Coordinates of C-alpha atoms and ligand atoms in Angstrom, one line a residue:
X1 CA -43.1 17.3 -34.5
X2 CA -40.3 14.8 -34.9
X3 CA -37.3 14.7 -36.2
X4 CA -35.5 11.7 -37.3
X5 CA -31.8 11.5 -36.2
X6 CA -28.8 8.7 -35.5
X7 CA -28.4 8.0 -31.8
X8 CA -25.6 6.1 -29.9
X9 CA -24.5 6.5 -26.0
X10 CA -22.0 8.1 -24.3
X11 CA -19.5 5.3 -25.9
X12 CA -20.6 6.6 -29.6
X13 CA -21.4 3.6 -30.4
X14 CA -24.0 0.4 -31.9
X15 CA -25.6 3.7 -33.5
X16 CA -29.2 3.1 -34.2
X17 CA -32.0 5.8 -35.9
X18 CA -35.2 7.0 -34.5
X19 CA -37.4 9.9 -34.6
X20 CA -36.7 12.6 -31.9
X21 CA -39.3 14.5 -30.4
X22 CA -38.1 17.4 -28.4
X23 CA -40.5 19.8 -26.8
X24 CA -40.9 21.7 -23.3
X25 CA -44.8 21.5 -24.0
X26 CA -45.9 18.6 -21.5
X27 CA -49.3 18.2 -23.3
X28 CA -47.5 17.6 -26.4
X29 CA -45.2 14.7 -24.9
X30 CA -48.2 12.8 -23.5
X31 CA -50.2 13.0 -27.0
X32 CA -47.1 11.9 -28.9
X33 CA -47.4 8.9 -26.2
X34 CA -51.1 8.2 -27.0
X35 CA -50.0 8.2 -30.5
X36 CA -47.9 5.5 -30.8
X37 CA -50.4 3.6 -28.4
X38 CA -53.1 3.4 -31.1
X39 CA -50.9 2.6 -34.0
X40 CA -50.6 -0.8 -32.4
X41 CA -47.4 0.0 -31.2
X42 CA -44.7 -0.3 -33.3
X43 CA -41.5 -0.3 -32.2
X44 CA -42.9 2.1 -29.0
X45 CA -41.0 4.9 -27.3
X46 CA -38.3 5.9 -25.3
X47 CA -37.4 8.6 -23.1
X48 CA -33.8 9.9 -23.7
X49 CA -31.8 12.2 -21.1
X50 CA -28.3 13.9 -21.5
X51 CA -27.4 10.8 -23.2
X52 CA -24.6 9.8 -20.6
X53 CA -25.5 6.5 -20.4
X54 CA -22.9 4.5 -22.5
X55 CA -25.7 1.7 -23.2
X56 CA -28.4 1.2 -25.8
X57 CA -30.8 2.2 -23.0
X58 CA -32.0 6.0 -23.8
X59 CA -31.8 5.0 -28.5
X60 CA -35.2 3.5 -29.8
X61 CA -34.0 2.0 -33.5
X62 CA -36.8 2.8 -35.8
X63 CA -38.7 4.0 -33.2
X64 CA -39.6 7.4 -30.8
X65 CA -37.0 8.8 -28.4
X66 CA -38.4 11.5 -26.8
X67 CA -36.1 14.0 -25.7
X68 CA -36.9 15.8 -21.8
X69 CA -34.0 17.8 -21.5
X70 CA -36.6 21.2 -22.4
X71 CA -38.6 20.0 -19.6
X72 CA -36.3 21.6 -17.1
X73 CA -38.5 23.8 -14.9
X74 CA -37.3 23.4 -10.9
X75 CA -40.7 24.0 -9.1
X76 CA -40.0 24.6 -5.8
X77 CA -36.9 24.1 -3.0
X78 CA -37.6 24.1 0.7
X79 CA -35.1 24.6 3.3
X80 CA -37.1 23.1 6.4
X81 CA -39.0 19.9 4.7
X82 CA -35.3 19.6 2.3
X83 CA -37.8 18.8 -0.5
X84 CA -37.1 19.9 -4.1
X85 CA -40.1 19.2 -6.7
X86 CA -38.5 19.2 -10.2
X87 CA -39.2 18.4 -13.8
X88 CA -37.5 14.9 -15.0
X89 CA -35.3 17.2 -17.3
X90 CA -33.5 19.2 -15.0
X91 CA -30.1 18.3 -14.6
X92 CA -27.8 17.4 -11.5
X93 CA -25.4 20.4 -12.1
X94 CA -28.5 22.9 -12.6
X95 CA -30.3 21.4 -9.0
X96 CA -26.8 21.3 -7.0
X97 CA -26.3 25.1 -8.3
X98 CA -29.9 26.2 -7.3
X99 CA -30.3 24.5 -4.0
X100 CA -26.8 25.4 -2.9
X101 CA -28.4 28.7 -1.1
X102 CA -31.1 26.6 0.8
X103 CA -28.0 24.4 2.2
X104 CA -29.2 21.3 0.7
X105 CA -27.2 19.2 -1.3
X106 CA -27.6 16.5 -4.1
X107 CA -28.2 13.4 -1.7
X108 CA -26.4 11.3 -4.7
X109 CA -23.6 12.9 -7.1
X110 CA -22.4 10.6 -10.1
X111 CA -18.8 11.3 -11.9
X112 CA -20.3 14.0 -13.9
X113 CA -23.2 16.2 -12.8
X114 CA -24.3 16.4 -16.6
X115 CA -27.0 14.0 -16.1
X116 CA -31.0 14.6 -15.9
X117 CA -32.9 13.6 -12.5
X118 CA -35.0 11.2 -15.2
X119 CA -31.7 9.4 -15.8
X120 CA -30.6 9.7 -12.1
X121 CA -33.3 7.7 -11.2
X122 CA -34.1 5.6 -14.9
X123 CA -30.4 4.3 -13.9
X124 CA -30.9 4.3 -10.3
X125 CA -27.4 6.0 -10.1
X126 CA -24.8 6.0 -7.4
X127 CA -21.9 7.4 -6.7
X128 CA -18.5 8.2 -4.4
X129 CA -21.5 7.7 -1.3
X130 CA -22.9 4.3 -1.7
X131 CA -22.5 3.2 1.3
X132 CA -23.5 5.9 3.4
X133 CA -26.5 7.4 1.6
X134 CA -27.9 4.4 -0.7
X135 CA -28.3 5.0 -4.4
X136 CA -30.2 7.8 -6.3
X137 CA -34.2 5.7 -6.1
X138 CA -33.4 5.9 -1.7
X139 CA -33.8 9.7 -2.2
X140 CA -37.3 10.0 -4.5
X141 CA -40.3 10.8 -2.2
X142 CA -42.2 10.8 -4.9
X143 CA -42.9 10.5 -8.5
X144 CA -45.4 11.5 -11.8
X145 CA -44.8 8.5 -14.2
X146 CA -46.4 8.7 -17.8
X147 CA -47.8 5.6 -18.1
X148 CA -48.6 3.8 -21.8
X149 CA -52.3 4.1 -21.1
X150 CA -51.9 8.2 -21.6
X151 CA -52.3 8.1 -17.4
X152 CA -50.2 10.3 -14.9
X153 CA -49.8 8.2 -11.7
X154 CA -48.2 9.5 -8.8
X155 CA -45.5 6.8 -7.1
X156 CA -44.2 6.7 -3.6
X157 CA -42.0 4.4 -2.4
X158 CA -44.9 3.3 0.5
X159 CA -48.1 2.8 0.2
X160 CA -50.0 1.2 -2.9
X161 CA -48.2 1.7 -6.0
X162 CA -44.9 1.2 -4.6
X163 CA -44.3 -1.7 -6.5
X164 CA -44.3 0.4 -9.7
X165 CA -42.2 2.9 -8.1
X166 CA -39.5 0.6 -7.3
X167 CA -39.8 -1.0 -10.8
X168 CA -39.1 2.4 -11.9
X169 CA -36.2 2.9 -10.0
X170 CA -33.4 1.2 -12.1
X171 CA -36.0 0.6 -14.7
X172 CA -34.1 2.0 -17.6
X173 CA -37.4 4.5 -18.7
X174 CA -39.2 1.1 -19.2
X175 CA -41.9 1.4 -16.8
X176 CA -43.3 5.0 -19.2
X177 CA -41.6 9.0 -18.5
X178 CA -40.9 10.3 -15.4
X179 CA -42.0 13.5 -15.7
X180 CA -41.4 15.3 -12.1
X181 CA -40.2 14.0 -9.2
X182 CA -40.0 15.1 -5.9
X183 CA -36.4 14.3 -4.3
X184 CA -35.2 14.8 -0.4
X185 CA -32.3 16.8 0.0
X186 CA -29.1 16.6 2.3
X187 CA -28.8 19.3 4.6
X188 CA -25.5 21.0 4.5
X189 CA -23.5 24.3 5.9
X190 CA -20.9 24.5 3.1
X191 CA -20.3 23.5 -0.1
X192 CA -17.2 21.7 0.9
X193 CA -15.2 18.9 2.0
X194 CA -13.0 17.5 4.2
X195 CA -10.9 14.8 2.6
X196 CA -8.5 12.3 4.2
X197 CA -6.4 10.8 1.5
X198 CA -4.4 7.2 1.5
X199 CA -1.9 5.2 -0.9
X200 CA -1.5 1.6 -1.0
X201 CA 1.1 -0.7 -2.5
X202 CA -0.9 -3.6 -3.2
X203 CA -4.4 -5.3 -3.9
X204 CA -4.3 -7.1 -0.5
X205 CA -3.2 -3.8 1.4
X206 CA -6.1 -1.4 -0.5
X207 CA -9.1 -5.0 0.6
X208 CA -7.7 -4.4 3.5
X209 CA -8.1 -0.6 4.5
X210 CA -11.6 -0.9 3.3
X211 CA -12.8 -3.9 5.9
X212 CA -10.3 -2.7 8.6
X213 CA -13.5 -0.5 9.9
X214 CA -11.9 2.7 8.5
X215 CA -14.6 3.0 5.6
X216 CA -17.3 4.1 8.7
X217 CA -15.7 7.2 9.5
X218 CA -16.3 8.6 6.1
X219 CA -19.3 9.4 3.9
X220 CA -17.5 9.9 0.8
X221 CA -15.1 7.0 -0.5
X222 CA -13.7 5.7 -3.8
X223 CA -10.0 4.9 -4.9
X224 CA -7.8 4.7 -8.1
X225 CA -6.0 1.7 -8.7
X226 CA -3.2 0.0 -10.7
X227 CA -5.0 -2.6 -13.0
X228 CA -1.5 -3.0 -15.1
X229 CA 1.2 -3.4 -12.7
X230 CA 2.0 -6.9 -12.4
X231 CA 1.3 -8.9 -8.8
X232 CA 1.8 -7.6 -5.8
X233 CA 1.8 -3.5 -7.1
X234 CA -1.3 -5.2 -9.0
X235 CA -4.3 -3.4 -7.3
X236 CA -2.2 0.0 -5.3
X237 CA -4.5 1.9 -4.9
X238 CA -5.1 6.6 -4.2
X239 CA -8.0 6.5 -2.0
X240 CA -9.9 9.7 -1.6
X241 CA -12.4 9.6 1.3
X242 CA -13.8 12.0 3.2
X243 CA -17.3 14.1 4.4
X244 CA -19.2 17.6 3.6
X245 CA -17.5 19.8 5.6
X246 CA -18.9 22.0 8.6
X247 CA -18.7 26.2 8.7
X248 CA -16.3 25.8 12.1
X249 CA -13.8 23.0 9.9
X250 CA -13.6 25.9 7.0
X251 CA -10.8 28.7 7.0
X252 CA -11.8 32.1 7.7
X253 CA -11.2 33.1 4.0
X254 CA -13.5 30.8 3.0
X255 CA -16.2 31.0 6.6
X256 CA -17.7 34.2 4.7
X257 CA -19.5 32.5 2.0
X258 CA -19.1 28.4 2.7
X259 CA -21.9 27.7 0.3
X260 CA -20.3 29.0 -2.3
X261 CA -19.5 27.4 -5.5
X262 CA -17.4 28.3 -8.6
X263 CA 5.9 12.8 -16.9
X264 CA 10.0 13.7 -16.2
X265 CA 12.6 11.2 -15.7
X266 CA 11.3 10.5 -12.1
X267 CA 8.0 9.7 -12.8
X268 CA 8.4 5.8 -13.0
X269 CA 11.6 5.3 -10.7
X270 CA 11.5 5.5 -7.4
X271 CA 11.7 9.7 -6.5
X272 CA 8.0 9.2 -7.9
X273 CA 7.0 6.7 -6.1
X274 CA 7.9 8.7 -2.8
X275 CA 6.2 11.5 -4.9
X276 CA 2.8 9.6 -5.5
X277 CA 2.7 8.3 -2.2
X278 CA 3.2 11.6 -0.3
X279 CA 1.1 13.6 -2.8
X280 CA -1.3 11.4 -2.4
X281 CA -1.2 10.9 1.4
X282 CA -2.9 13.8 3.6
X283 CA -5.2 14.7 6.4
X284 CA -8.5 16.8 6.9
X285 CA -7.5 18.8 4.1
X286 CA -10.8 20.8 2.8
X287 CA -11.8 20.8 -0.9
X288 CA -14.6 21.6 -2.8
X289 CA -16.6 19.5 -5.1
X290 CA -14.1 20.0 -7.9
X291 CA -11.3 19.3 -6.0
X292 CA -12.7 16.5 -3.9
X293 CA -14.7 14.4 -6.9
X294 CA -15.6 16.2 -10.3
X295 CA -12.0 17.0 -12.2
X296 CA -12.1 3.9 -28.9
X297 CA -13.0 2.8 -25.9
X298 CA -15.0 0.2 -23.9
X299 CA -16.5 1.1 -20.6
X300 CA -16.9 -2.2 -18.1
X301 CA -18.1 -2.0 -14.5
X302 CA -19.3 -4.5 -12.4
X303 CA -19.7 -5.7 -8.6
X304 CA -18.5 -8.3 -6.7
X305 CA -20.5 -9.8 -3.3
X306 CA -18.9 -8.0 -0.2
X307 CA -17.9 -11.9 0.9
X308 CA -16.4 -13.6 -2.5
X309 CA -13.2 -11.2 -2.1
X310 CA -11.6 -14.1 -3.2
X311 CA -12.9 -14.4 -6.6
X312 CA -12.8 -10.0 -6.6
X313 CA -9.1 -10.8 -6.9
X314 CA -9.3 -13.4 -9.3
X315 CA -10.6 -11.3 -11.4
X316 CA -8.1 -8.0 -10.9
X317 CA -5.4 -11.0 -12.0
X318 CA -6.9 -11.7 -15.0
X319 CA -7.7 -8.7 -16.5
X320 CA -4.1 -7.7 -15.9
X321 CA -2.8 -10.6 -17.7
X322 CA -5.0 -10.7 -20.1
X323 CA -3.2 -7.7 -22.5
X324 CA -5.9 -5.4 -22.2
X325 CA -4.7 -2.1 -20.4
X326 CA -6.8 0.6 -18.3
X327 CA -5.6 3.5 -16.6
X328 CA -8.8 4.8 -15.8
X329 CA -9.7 2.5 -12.8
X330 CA -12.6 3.3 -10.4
X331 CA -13.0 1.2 -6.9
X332 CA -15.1 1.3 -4.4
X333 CA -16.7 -0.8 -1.5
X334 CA -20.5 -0.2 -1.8
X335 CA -23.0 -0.1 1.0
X336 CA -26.8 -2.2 1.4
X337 CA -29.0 -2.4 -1.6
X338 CA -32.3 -0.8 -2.0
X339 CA -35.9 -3.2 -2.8
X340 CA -35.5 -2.1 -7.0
X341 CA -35.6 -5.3 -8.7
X342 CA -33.1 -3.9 -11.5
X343 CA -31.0 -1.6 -9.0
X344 CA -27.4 -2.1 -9.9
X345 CA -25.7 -2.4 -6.7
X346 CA -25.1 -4.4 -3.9
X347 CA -22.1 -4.8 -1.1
X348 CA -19.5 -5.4 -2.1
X349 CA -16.2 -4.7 -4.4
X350 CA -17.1 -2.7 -7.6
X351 CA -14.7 -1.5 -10.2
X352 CA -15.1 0.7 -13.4
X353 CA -12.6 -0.2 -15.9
X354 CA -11.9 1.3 -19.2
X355 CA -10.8 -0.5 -22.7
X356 CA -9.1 0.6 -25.2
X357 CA -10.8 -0.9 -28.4
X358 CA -8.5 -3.5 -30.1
X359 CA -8.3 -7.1 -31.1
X360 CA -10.3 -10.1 -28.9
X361 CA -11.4 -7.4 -26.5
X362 CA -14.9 -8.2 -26.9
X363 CA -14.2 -11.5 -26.7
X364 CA -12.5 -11.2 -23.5
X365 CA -15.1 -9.2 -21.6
X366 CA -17.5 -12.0 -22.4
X367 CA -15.7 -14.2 -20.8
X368 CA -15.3 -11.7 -17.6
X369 CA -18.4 -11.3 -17.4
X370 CA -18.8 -15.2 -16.8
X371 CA -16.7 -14.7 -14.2
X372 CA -18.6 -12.1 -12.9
X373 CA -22.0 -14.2 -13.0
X374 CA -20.1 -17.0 -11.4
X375 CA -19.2 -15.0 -8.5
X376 CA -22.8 -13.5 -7.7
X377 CA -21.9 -10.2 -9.5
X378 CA -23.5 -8.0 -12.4
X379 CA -22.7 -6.0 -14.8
X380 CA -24.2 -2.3 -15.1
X381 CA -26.8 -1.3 -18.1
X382 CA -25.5 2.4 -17.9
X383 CA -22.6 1.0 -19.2
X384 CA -23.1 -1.7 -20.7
X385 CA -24.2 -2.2 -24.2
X386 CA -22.4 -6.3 -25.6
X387 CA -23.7 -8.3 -22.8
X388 CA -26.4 -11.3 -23.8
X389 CA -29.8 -11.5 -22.3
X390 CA -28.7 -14.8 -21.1
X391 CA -26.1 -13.2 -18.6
X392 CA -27.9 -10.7 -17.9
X393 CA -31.1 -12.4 -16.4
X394 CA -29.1 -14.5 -14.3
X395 CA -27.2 -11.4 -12.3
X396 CA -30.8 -10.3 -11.7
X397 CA -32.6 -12.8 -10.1
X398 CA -35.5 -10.6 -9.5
X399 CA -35.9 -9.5 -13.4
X400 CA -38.9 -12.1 -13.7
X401 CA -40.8 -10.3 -11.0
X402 CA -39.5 -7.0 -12.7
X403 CA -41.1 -8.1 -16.0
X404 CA -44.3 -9.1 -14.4
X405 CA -45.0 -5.3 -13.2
X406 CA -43.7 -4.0 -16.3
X407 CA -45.9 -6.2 -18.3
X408 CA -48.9 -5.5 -15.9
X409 CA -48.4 -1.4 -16.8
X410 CA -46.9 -1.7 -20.1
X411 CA -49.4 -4.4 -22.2
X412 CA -48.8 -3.6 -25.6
X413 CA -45.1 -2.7 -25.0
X414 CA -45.8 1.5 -26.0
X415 CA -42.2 1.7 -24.3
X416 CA -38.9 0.1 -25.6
X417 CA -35.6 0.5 -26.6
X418 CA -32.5 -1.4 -28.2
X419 CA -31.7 -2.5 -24.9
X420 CA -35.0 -4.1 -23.8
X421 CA -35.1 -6.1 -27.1
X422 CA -31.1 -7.0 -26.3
X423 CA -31.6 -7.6 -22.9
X424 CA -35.1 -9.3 -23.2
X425 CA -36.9 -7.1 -21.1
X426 CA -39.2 -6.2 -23.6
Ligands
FAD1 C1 -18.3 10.6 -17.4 C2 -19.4 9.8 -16.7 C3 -19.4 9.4 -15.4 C4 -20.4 8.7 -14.8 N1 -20.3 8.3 -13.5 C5 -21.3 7.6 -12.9 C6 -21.3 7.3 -11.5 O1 -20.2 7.7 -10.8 N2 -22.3 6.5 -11.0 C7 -23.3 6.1 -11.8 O2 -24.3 5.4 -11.2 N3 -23.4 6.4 -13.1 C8 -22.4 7.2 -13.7 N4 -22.5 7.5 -15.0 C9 -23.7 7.0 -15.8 C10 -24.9 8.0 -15.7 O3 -25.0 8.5 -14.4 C11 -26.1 7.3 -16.1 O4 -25.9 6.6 -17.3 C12 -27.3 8.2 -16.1 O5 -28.5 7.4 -16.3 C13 -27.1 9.3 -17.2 O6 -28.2 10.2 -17.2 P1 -28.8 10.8 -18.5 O7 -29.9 11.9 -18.3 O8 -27.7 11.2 -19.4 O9 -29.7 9.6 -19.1 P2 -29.7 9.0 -20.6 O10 -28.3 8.5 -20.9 O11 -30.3 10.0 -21.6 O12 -30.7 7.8 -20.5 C14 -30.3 6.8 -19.5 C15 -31.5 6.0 -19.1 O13 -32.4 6.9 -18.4 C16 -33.7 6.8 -19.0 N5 -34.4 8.1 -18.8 C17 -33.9 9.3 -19.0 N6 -34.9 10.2 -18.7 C18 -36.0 9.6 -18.4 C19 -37.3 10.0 -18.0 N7 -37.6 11.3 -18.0 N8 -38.2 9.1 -17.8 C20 -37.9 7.8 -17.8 N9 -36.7 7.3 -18.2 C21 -35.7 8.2 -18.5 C22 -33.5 6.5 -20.4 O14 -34.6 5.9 -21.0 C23 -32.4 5.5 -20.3 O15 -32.9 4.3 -20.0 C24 -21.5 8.2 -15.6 C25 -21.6 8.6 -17.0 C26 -20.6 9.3 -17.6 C27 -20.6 9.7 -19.0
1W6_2 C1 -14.3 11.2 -11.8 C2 -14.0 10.6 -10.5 O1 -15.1 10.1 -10.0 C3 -15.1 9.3 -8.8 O2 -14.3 9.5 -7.9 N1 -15.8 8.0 -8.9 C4 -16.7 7.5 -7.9 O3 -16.5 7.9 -6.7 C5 -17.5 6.3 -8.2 C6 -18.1 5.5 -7.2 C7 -18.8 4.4 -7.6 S1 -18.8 4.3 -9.3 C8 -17.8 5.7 -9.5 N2 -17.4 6.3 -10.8 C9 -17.7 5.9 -12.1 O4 -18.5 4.9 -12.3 C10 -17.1 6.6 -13.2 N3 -17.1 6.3 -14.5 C11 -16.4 7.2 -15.3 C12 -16.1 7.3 -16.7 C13 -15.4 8.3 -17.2 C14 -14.9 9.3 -16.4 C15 -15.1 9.3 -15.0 C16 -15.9 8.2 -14.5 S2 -16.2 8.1 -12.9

């Protein structure tokens, strides 16, 4: 049956032990369920993904993480209802490949595609289309959730149930295992894009192309920016926006098949800055996924309220003064929220920043994520694995409510992980 084995996240870290169950036999997962339901309950289960969560989310410590990856059978894919039906454990990479020929694409892509349709949701991801097309849960038409009592229930977003649905979006596999789910689709004619690209010189200049009105034309939008040049280079930013491209918009080469898919001395003077800035400067010019969004350490992301821009660059300041360098530096404006009490994002400025491990770090980041809490913001559980309870409950006002459905279907807490018992969601 099991096998016991050290798990961490995606960071390879705060490693913990568990027993690892890991078949594509369905019966067997929902016995191994009613199992640790009678022995009292333990320290429960959890289901684990493709482990890209950097978090403590998808590792049960002396407990049962239940691996869904076998579980990878795609159902069905419909052209004219754009409906896929799909087992938790298929991945994104494996859907965008398969549904490709119908013309539908993945209505939410993350940074890597190597990540299950259990996690998509589990995390209620998001991605380089926010605001445009909502997170991951806005896409789920419906779902089968393995529930602690050894039940199937089928969620939709209306109707009764809902609530449990939506407490399974961004629930962090909390709620029991998603076992199939059945997504809608964006309708596409190519697998391509056409991308608009923009430099700016400072943090005021990159706020300001994304409330100028600019950020409606386009679908697609994110941005690198400087988080280690001093003030005012402090917060230049490449932004990459653009939308799926149209058959007519694609060169003949390429019109055939448009669904298909498959440092010098300069550098830091003043010839590269003229380099960087027209590189990185262009119009309507058509890429592919790759191309266009798919090319130690402490991950750290949070969001900022669209309105307190104020504070947002408060805190850009202070985490370039405070020592701690990242290269790797994701923004984006986001778009509306969705009704999941534990969804992740809201409007407004969010950043991904990345730590190298060294002395007072982890103090630091407690102290940013004060900041964040005191500007209306949150941190994100997929990446987040040092925050306190404490924090966390107060950047999710609705984790109260949350709790109260969790505790409704979960009684005897059959489901947990290091991060409910961290986090206090238990
Ligand atoms: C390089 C990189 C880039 C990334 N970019 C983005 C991004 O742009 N946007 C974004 O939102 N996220 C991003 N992520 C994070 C990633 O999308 C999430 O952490 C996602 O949840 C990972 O999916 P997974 O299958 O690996 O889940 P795991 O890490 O295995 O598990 C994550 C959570 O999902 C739950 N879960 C998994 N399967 C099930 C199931 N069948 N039933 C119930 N619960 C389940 C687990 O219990 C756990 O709570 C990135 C991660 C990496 C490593
Ligand atoms: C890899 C480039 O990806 C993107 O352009 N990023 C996005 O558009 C985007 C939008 C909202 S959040 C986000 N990206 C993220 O949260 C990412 N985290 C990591 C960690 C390691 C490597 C790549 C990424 S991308």
């Amino acid at each position: 049956t099991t096998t016991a084995t050290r798990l961490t996240g995606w960071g390879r870290t705060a490693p913990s032990v568990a027993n690892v169950l890991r078949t594509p036999d369905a019966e067997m997962i929902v016995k191994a369920v009613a199992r640790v339901a009678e022995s009292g309950g333990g320290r429960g289960a959890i289901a684990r993904g493709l482990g890209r969560s950097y978090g403590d989310n998808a590792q049960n410590g002396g407990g049962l993480v239940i691996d869904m990856t076998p579980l990878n059978t795609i159902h069905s894919i419909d052209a004219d209802t754009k409906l896929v039906d799909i087992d938790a454990g298929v991945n994104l990479d494996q859907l965008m490949k398969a549904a490709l020929p119908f013309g539908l694409w993945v209505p939410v892509l993350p940074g890597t595609r190597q990540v299950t349709v259990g996690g998509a949701i589990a995390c209620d991801i998001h991605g380089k289309n926010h605001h445009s097309a909502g997170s991951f849960g806005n896409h789920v038409r419906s779902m089968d959730l393995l529930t602690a009592d050894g039940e199937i229930r089928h969620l939709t977003p209306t109707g009764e149930d809902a609530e449990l649905f939506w407490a399974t979006v961004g629930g962090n596999g909390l709620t029991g295992i998603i076992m199939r789910a059945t997504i809608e689709m964006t309708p596409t004619s190519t697998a391509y894009f056409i991308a608009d690209g923009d430099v700016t010189a400072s943090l005021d200049e990159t706020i300001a192309l994304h409330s100028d009105g600019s950020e409606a034309r386009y679908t697609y939008s994110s941005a690198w920016f400087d988080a280690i040049s001093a003030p005012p280079k402090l917060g230049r930013a490449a932004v990459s926006r653009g939308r799926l491209a149209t058959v007519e918009q694609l060169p003949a080469k390429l019109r055939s098949e448009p669904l298909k898919f498959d440092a010098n001395k300069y550098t830091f003077g003043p010839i590269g800055e003229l380099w960087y800035r027209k590189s990185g400067t262009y119009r309507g010019k058509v890429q592919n996924l790759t191309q266009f969004y798919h090319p130690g350490f402490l991950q750290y992301q949070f969001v900022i309220p669209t309105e307190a821009v104020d504070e947002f660059k408060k805190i850009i300041g202070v985490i370039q003064a405070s020592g701690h360098y990242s290269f790797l530096n994701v923004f984006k404006l986001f778009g509306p929220r969705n009704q999941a009490p534990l969804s992740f994002p809201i409007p407004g400025w969010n950043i991904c920043v990345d730590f190298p491990i060294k002395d007072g770090l982890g103090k630091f980041v407690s102290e940013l994520d004060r900041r964040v809490l005191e500007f209306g913001g949150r941190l994100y559980t997929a990446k987040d694995s040092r925050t306190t309870a404490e924090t966390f409950h107060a950047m999710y006002p609705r984790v109260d409510e949350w709790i109260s459905v969790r505790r409704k279907v979960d009684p005897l807490r059959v489901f947990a992980s290091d991060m409910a018992r961290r986090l206090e969601l238990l």
